[PDB]
Amino acid sequence: GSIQTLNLDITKVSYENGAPMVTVFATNEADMPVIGLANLEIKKALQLIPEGATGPGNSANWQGLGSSKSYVDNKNGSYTFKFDAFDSNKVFNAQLTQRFNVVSAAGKLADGTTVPVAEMVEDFDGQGNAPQYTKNIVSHEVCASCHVEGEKIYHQATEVETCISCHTQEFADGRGKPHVAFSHLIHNVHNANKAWGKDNKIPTVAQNIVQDNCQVCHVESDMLTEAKNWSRIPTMEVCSSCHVDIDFAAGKGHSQQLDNSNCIACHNSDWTAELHTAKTTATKNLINQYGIETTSTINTETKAATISVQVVDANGTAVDLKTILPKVQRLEIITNVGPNNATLGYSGKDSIFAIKNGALDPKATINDAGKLVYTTTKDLKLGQNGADSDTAFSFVGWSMCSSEGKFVDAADPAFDGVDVTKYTGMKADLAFATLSGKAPSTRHVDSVNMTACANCHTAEFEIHKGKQHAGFVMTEQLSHTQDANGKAIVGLDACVTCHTPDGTYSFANRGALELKLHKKHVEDAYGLIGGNCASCHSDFNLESFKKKGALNTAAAADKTGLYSTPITATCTTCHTVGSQYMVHTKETLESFGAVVDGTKDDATSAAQSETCFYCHTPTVADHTKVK
Numbered sequence: 178g179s180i181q182t183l184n185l186d187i188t189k190v191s192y193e194n195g196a197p198m199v200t201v202f203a204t205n206e207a208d209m210p211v212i213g214l215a216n217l218e219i220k221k222a223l224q225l226i227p228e229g230a231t232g233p234g235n236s237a238n239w240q241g242l243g244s245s246k247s248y249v250d251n252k253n254g255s256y257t258f259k260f261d262a263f264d265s266n267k268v269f270n271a272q273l274t275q276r277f278n279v280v281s282a283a284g285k286l287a288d289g290t291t292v293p294v295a296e297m298v299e300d301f302d303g304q305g306n307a308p309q310y311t312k313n314i315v316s317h318e319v320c321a322s323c324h325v326e327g328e329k330i331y332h333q334a335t336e337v338e339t340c341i342s343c344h345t346q347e348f349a350d351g352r353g354k355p356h357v358a359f360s361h362l363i364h365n366v367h368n369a370n371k372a373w374g375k376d377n378k379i380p381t382v383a384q385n386i387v388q389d390n391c392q393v394c395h396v397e398s399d400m401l402t403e404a405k406n407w408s409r410i411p412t413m414e415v416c417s418s419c420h421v422d423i424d425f426a427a428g429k430g431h432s433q434q435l436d437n438s439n440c441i442a443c444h445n446s447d448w449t450a451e452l453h454t455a456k457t458t459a460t461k462n463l464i465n466q467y468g469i470e471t472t473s474t475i476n477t478e479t480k481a482a483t484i485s486v487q488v489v490d491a492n493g494t495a496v497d498l499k500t501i502l503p504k505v506q507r508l509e510i511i512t513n514v515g516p517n518n519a520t521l522g523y524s525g526k527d528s529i530f531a532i533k534n535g536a537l538d539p540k541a542t543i544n545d546a547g548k549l550v551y552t553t554t555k556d557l558k559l560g561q562n563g564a565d566s567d568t569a570f571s572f573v574g575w576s577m578c579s580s581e582g583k584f585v586d587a588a589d590p591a592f593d594g595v596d597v598t599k600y601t602g603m604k605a606d607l608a609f610a611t612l613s614g615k616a617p618s619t620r621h622v623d624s625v626n627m628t629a630c631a632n633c634h635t636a637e638f639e640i641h642k643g644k645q646h647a648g649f650v651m652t653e654q655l656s657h658t659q660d661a662n663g664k665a666i667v668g669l670d671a672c673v674t675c676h677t678p679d680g681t682y683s684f685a686n687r688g689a690l691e692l693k694l695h696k697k698h699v700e701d702a703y704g705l706i707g708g709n710c711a712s713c714h715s716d717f718n719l720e721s722f723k724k725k726g727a728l729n730t731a732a733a734a735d736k737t738g739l740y741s742t743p744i745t746a747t748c749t750t751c752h753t754v755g756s757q758y759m760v761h762t763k764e765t766l767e768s769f770g771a772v773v774d775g776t777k778d779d780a781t782s783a784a785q786s787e788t789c790f791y792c793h794t795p796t797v798a799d800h801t802k803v804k
């Protein structure tokens with residue numbers, strides 16, 4: 178027995194006896210009644226003090242009426258709560274909106290059926306009818322973009338409405354701690370201007386992901402009638418959460434404000450909304466002004482790839498590159514071979530900055546058709562490593578010079594790209610060519626795609642933007658397949674040009690794409706992801722292992738490469754051999770056909786000898802499934 182989803186509805190609220198009687202109906206993912214819940218509770222009963230009631234400019238706030246774990250299982254999927262101690266403070270007002278926060282703890286029914294956590298709020302008028310007014314600003318779904326759905330976020334609960342129901346203005350006032358009001362706390366813990374908690378945690382990582390972008394949590398919605406409160410209700414209590422150096426009482430860093438009466442008179446919604454979103458809006462506008470369309474052909478006699486880049490405008494119309502060359506900050510072309518098992522390594526790949534700060538490299542030209550044209554100089558070794566090695570794949574990244582939301586001419590040929598306020602990474606592209614002239618091989622893209630990355634990093638993520646790279650914006654420009662609904666898949670297959678089976682610049686960094694995303698995110702995003710493979714994966718492509726060879730897993734004492742068989746290499750990124758995270762010894766892994774941190778030749782020869790998937794049957798839902 179296992180329930181996948183527990184749905185909760187408050188179906189009836191009756192005040193016929195004084196204190197409300199509250200009926201909850203519980204169903205599973207199949208809409209069948211759930212009988213026997215043992216940990217159902219009204220975690221909070223509240224009523225809504227309306228906006229301005231506590232003073233001009235002040236927020237609406239949730240006033241406490243108690244809680245209850247007292248209920249009858251009616252044996253039909255419904256549960257009826259009573260309150261032993263309703264409204265201890267004697268503030269109940271039937272003219273106010275009434276809220277109930279209902280939670281069901283993860284656990285087991287009696288029959289042993291597993292039941293997942295469930296939370297909800299529902300609002301009512303003072304007689305249990307539909308409510309007359311609400312404070313509906315955000316919904317739990319925005320938090321699930323970045324925090325694993327169904328797991329506690331910091332503590333107590335899994336859904337933002339539960340946090341909001343306890344972290345009230347009344348709660349903060351009662352503790353003498355303004356900062357624990359949820360509308361203060363939530364900005365505080367994602368903003369690095371001040372630390373939080375006894376430990377003085379500086380939110381460096383939250384700051385680097387969220388970047389004060391109001392629109393990752395504040396989203397307009399017919400379902401959320403107070404969604405525009407983020408710009409319409411300026412208060413010292415909320416604005417000070419990130420604006421930490423103003424003292425409104427003393428008039429330091431701002432004119433004196435003794436209350437919230439005048440904030441909106443000067444801080445109009447249009448200005449607050451515009452000023453906090455201006456820069457991301459302007460950047461997104463610049464990224465969407467141009468595209469590129471890239472082709473690649475192999476000379477059958479020289480075995481060199483020629484890559485052609487067509488700039489296009491927002492409508493897909495040709496732009497001659499000569500017209501915008503002075504504004505191009507960088508354009509880079511990286512070519513590798515064998516899209517399912519890259520063969521040239523990091524050191525052997527072909528790479529060029531065809532354009533730097535408005536100057537063509539002498540190896541790149543613009544033809545009479547207005548296309549940039551570049552021919553590889555490295556030995557591509559086409560056809561030297563089986564059918565996959567027939568195919569060259571070329572990744573194009575580029576950037577435009579930009580200031581205050583406009584493209585500008587490059588004024589400084591030596592501009593180093595460190596100052597990311599001076600340029601915009603643009604839409605990257607991927608082009609395939611074959612030596613044989615047959616259709617190209619392509620890597621699988623059916624297990625991970627850029628939609629998952631964009632949940633935390635946004636669709637405008639300028640990957641590697643800085644001193645070393647233009648910034649790769651990943652879009653349908655480099656899609657070559659569709660999912661089962663016909664949606665273009667934006668794969669990470671182009672990243673393999675550098676993230677090769679031989680690693681990146683050093684044999685020490687687990688640079689292969691099969692290892693690198695796991696290594697970065699298990700080290701730096703475990704608070705968000707932990708073991709949640711679904712944060713990136715729709716599926717595992719286990720069949721892809723049959724196209725892999727050796728994967729670089731370590732550097733020897735002399736700085737040369739050590740390699741593992743590909744399943745062992747992939748699992749060991751998070752399961753280090755000889756650590757507390759890996760039960761299998763090296764000897765045991767070798768008994769299962771593996772090479773652990775051996776020579777490229779030994780790992781290549783053994784790459785299809787691993788018996789791991791005889792026992793292991795990983796799925797995204799449970800990657801641990803085995804024996």
Ligand code: HEC
Pocket residue numbers: 315319320321322323324330331337340363366367380382383384386387393394632633634701702704705
């Ligand atoms: C991605 C853009 C995010 C969205 C949307 C939300 N949160 Fe977040 N949060 C995020 C990061 C990158 C971090 C820092 C993690 C780290 O490792 O340092 C956080 C941090 C928090 C915290 C602090 C405690 C913690 O879990 O580390 C809280 C309490 C928190 N976040 C809550 C939260 C809620 C309730 C959200 C929806 C309104 C929410 N976050 C959105 C990234 C993102």
Ligand code: HEC
Pocket residue numbers: 329330331332333334335336337339340341342343344352354356357362366373374375
């Ligand atoms: C009451 C039933 C709570 C619910 C639901 C949530 N939290 Fe909470 N939180 C609670 C208490 C009693 C405290 C200590 C307050 C104090 O006096 O210091 C907290 C504290 C936090 C903090 C630390 C805030 C700070 O020190 O600046 C965070 C980041 C926090 N709580 C987050 C949080 C989130 C995201 C919740 C919903 C998932 C949540 N809390 C619910 C009580 C209650």
Ligand code: HEC
Pocket residue numbers: 236237312313314315337341359360363364367387389390391392393394395406407408410411412415416453
């Ligand atoms: C998620 C990590 C958020 C980001 C980023 C920002 N805000 Fe936010 N805000 C968030 C929550 C969960 C809440 C509480 C909502 C509730 O129902 O209590 C808020 C609240 C505000 C408010 C208060 C509105 C009111 O009625 O008093 C304001 C003025 C506000 N938020 C503004 C704001 C701005 C300007 C941001 C970008 C700079 C922004 N928020 C980011 C969650 C998150």
Ligand code: HEC
Pocket residue numbers: 364368389390407408410411412415416417418419420444449452453455456
């Ligand atoms: C963190 C999530 C923030 C909250 C909450 C609020 N603001 Fe903010 N504000 C923030 C940043 C990162 C910036 C710089 C933005 C940029 O692109 O330049 C700002 C800026 C302002 C400004 C302009 C700067 C100035 O010196 O006055 C104003 C007037 C401003 N912010 C007002 C404001 C108000 C009224 C808020 C509560 C509704 C508020 N901010 C919240 C980050 C955050």
Ligand code: HEC
Pocket residue numbers: 411412413414416417420423425431434436437438439440441442443444
């Ligand atoms: C008009 C007479 C104002 C009243 C009343 C309030 N504020 Fe203000 N504020 C005003 C100006 C002209 C500026 C500078 C704008 C700029 O872009 O330079 C501000 C600034 C702020 C900021 C930003 C602080 C910073 O980034 O340095 C915040 C967060 C802010 N103001 C909030 C705020 C609140 C909450 C008010 C009522 C208590 C309030 N301001 C009153 C103009 C006026």
Ligand code: HEC
Pocket residue numbers: 322323324381382385386625626627629630631632633634640641669694697698701702705706712713
């Ligand atoms: C939220 C749950 C995330 C998902 C999904 C993905 N990434 Fe991520 N990434 C996340 C965090 C919290 C951090 C560390 C930030 C810090 O400041 O330390 C990262 C880091 C990266 C980096 C490093 C560069 C950077 O901008 O910090 C890269 C290049 C990166 N992440 C890429 C990436 C890709 C391609 C993803 C889809 C496979 C991806 N991330 C998912 C949080 C999250």
Ligand code: HEC
Pocket residue numbers: 511572640641646649651669671672673674675676681682686687688693694697
């Ligand atoms: C060669 C021009 C590269 C391309 C194309 C991509 N990456 Fe990269 N990446 C590269 C180097 C030299 C390094 C540092 C050494 C190392 O292997 O760690 C990286 C690093 C990453 C990281 C780790 C964190 C960081 O340093 O930013 C991640 C998560 C990463 N790279 C992801 C990534 C993705 C998703 C790419 C396709 C969009 C991608 N890289 C392309 C070199 C190059």
Ligand code: HEC
Pocket residue numbers: 620621624625669670690691694695698706708709710711712713714716717718719721747795800
């Ligand atoms: C985003 C930060 C990721 C998380 C979280 C996890 N995986 Fe992953 N995985 C990721 C990428 C970018 C790739 C490379 C795809 C490529 O083209 O090489 C992978 C690859 C795997 C593979 C190889 C098979 C495949 O589908 O490509 C396996 C078996 C795999 N990942 C397993 C896995 C497990 C078990 C996770 C949860 C603990 C997990 N991944 C998280 C990115 C991310």
Ligand code: HEC
Pocket residue numbers: 695696699707708744747748749750751752760793795800801802803
């Ligand atoms: C990082 C992105 C991971 C990759 C890649 C893989 N695993 Fe994993 N695994 C990971 C975590 C964070 C955990 C939970 C650890 C804890 O105790 O909380 C696990 C757990 C397992 C387990 C269960 C633990 C045990 O002692 O056996 C198994 C069997 C397991 N993982 C197997 C496994 C295999 C076969 C992988 C390659 C296909 C693999 N994991 C990759 C994180 C990550």
Ligand code: HEC
Pocket residue numbers: 744745748749752757758759760761766769770771787788789790791792793801803804
């Ligand atoms: C059956 C005889 C097995 C073969 C063949 C392989 N593994 Fe295994 N593995 C097995 C069991 C019974 C367990 C523990 C399961 C549990 O829940 O406790 C494991 C565990 C792992 C783990 C998790 C390690 C940890 O977290 O400590 C990993 C990463 C793992 N196994 C990988 C792995 C690889 C790469 C194999 C082929 C070389 C392999 N296993 C073979 C059972 C069996």
Ligand SMILES: [Ca+2]
Pocket residue numbers: 186187188189299
């Ligand atoms: Ca209802």
Ligand SMILES: [Ca+2]
Pocket residue numbers: 295296297336
């Ligand atoms: Ca819910």
Ligand SMILES: [Ca+2]
Pocket residue numbers: 364365366367368369370371372373380418
């Ligand atoms: Ca802070």
Ligand SMILES: [Ca+2]
Pocket residue numbers: 469470471606607654655656
């Ligand atoms: Ca293309």
Ligand SMILES: [Ca+2]
Pocket residue numbers: 785786787
């Ligand atoms: Ca075999």
